[PDB]
Amino acid sequence: MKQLEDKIEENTSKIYHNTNEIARNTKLVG
Amino acid sequence: MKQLEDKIEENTSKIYHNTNEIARNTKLVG
Amino acid sequence: MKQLEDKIEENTSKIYHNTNEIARNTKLVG
Numbered sequence A, B, C: 001m002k003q004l005e006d007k008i009e010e011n012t013s014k015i016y017h018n019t020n021e022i023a024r025n026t027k028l029v030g
Helices: A002-029 B002-029 C002-029
Strands: none
Touching: A002 B002, A002 C002, B002 C002
């Protein structure tokens, strides 16, 4: 369970940062 | 298993939406 | 464990590719 939870959280964090950078680019292309 | 599967699916959904927004921005920057 | 690990890795790969495309768009909007 716990190492798998660690891997999922690493992906959750990568997704978080990507979502912010996508939003930044969305604003610039507007 | 099942709560972990729930978390993975939440990430799969976030990735799905991000992929669509990235494609949108890709088209605009072309 | 193993099928769940497979699903996590599929997400890790999708995130990898999205990160590269986001970087590409970031450079173009600069």
